[PDB]
């Protein structure tokens, strides 16, 4: 049922989604869906282009993304957003760094 390109897209998305650390913590959990403008106003003041994994998953599932590196660039913007808005001392910031590494390892393989 999946084409090669769909399959590659899915593999990159699932690698980031399913990653768990050695304690069983799923780092992606908080990245799935951005809170509202009233819930996280300071993020929307700080970030020009909001992104979350549900937005990427929808784009993937409408068979948009013409190539793998488009999806990589949307994940990279998401993690760059997280690290612009949050302080380096925060857990989400550290989590964004780890998932960014996981994303690139997957891409390096294809
Ligand atoms: C509850 C805080 C959620 C949050 N804080 N900072 C964030 O930066 C992000 O880039 C991001 C992306 C997708 C979902 C949530 C957040 C986020």
UniProtKB/Swiss-Prot annotation:
Annotated positions of the Phosphoserine modification: 36
Compartment(s) where it occurs, according to its Swiss-Prot or TrEMBL record: Nucleus
Domain of life of the source: Eukaryota
Disulphide bridges: none
Residues passing through the membrane, by range: none
Expression sites by tissue: Widely expressed.
Mutagenesis / variant outcome for changing residue 21 to E: Found in a case of clear cell renal carcinoma; somatic mutation
Domain Bromo, residue spans: 1-110
Disease: Renal cell carcinoma: Renal cell carcinoma is a heterogeneous group of sporadic or hereditary carcinoma derived from cells of the proximal renal tubular epithelium. It is subclassified into clear cell renal carcinoma (non-papillary carcinoma), papillary renal cell carcinoma, chromophobe renal cell carcinoma, collecting duct carcinoma with medullary carcinoma of the kidney, and unclassified renal cell carcinoma. Clear cell renal cell carcinoma is the most common subtype.
Subunit text: Component of the SWI/SNF-B (PBAF) chromatin remodeling complex, at least composed of SMARCA4/BRG1, SMARCB1/BAF47/SNF5, ACTL6A/BAF53A or ACTL6B/BAF53B, SMARCE1/BAF57, SMARCD1/BAF60A, SMARCD2/BAF60B, perhaps SMARCD3/BAF60C, SMARCC1/BAF155, SMARCC2/BAF170, PBRM1/BAF180, ARID2/BAF200 and actin. Interacts with PHF10/BAF45A. Interacts with acetylated 'Lys-14' of histone H3 (H3K14ac), and may also interact with other acetylated or methylated Lys residues on histone H3.
Function, as annotated: Involved in transcriptional activation and repression of select genes by chromatin remodeling (alteration of DNA-nucleosome topology). Required for the stability of the SWI/SNF chromatin remodeling complex SWI/SNF-B (PBAF). Acts as a negative regulator of cell proliferation.
Protein name: Protein polybromo-1
Residues of the full protein shown: 654 to 763 of 1689
């Amino acid at each position: 049922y999946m084409t090669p390109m769909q399959q590659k897209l899915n593999e990159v998305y699932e690698a980031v989604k399913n990653y768990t650390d050695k304690r069983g913590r799923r780092l992606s959990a908080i990245f799935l869906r951005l809170p509202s403008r009233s819930e996280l106003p300071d993020y929307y003041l700080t970030i020009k282009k909001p992104m979350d994994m549900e937005k990427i998953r929808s784009h993937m599932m409408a068979n948009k993304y013409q190539d793998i590196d488009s999806m990589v660039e949307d994940f990279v913007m998401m993690f760059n957003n997280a690290c612009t808005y949050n302080e380096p001392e925060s857990l989400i910031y550290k989590d964004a760094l780890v998932l960014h590494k996981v994303l690139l390892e997957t891409r390096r393989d294809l």
